[PDB]
Design a protein around this ligand. Structure first.
Ligand SMILES: [Fe+2]
Length: 398
């Protein structure tokens, strides 16, 4: 197997486990704490805030340690965070059936589960930056990164779609433990693939404030897109389509499942324009395409009838092609421009800015819960996309 293929292989194997575990966690939490949707929501809060605080620290860490040390810590931190996740899950489940739903021990085991969620989240982040933003631009020719990145995206999408199917089949919470074992095993092949490629190549040879770097505006333009509720899997939109739009749930599900389809189209359209028009302009056209498509979607949203609801949803799906396109573009731009010595720091600034956006989106769905308040979330989402377009146009003047 070639170098570029080995990198994609380890990614594919570990992702299918990631997407599987990330799928059953809310459902498992629902089994242990039924009727309390606040539990699953509070779990993901601790993870995101936990990963947040630990992001700049890990960034400086990646830049001051051997690559084989980042990979080792990056992967095995996930391995034991999931292993502990299974244990605490089993203890939580076992204790509840035993009748201890109102004890301090239940809370301690939940914080433990949450904290293990933080570590897995962190290790996954350290690994993403290591594999995709350090090892890849060090092993793969610059003219072949666009091809590399497309297959990364398809891995994400394939496993995203493959997760509810396989894990849904496998899943007292015994199916959850078959998911975790899958997830655990899935970590191993990549670590050794990553270990061995380092040991036999020049990757061993690497010599070991952030907002004031020009590439932050590239980072900011991508993070702004995370401040959006105009997404097929967005819960606020799914709820809105159900009650205010009075759409069939069968059609809401179809709209949801077509997100990965249009995302896959980007892996065809975006590399094509890069080969024809170049990296920057391709990112511009795709990012602009998202703006125009969403701009039409919002125009139809108000007003406003139940006849424009498909123009609303249809243009959202079209914007997914543009969104996923610019995503690979901004990603490759960080692969190409970020200096080797600051790959851990600057890419962590990226994760920090996207995590912040997600946290704001959490706080927006909590402070604006009404379905009559959804109207403002549409207007703000569009604004964030339009601002992103301006910020990226300005930056691309380089
Ligand atoms: Fe994995």
């Amino acid at each position: 197997l070639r170098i570029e293929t080995q990198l994609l292989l380890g990614r594919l194997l570990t992702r299918s486990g990631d997407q599987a575990w990330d799928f059953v966690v809310p459902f498992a939490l629902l089994v242990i704490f039924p009727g309390k949707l606040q539990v699953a929501a509070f779990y993901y809060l601790i993870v995101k805030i936990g990963t947040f605080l630990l992001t700049p620290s890990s960034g400086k860490w990646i830049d001051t340690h051997p690559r084989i040390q980042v990979v080792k810590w990056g992967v095995w931190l996930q391995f034991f965070a999931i292993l502990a996740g299974m244990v605490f899950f089993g203890m939580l489940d076992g204790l509840v059936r035993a009748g201890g739903r109102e004890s301090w021990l239940l809370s301690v085991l939940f914080i433990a589960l949450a904290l293990s969620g933080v570590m897995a989240s962190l290790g996954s982040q350290i690994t993403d930056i290591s594999v995709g933003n350090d090892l890849a631009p060090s092993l793969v020719a610059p003219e072949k990164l666009t091809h590399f990145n497309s297959w990364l995206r398809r891995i994400d999408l394939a496993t995203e779609v493959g997760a509810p199917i396989l894990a849904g089949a496998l899943f007292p919470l015994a199916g959850l433990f078959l998911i975790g074992l899958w997830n655990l095993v899935s970590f191993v092949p990549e670590y050794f693939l990553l270990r061995n490629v380092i040991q036999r190549s020049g990757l061993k040879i690497k010599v070991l404030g952030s907002f004031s770097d020009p590439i932050f505006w590239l980072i900011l333009s991508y993070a702004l897109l995370w401040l959006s509720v105009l997404s097929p899997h967005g819960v606020l939109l799914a709820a809105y389509l159900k009650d205010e739009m009075r759409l069939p749930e069968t059609e809401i599900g179809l709209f949801r499942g077509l997100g990965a389809v249009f995302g896959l189209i980007s892996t065809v359209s975006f590399p094509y324009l890069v080969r024809r028009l170049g990296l920057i302009s391709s990112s511009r056209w795709h990012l602009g395409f998202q703006g125009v498509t969403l701009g039409i979607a919002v125009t139809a949203f108000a007003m406003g009838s139940t006849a424009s609801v498909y123009v609303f949803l249809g243009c959202i799906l079209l914007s997914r092609v543009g969104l996923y396109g610019f995503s690979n573009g901004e990603f490759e731009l960080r692969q190409r421009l970020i200096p080797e010595g600051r790959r851990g720091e600057l890419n962590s600034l990226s994760s920090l800015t996207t995590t912040s956006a997600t946290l704001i989106l959490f706080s927006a769905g909590s402070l604006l819960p009404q379905t009559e308040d959804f109207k403002y979330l549409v207007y703000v989402s569009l604004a964030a996309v339009l601002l992103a377009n301006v910020v990226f146009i300005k930056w691309s003047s380089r």
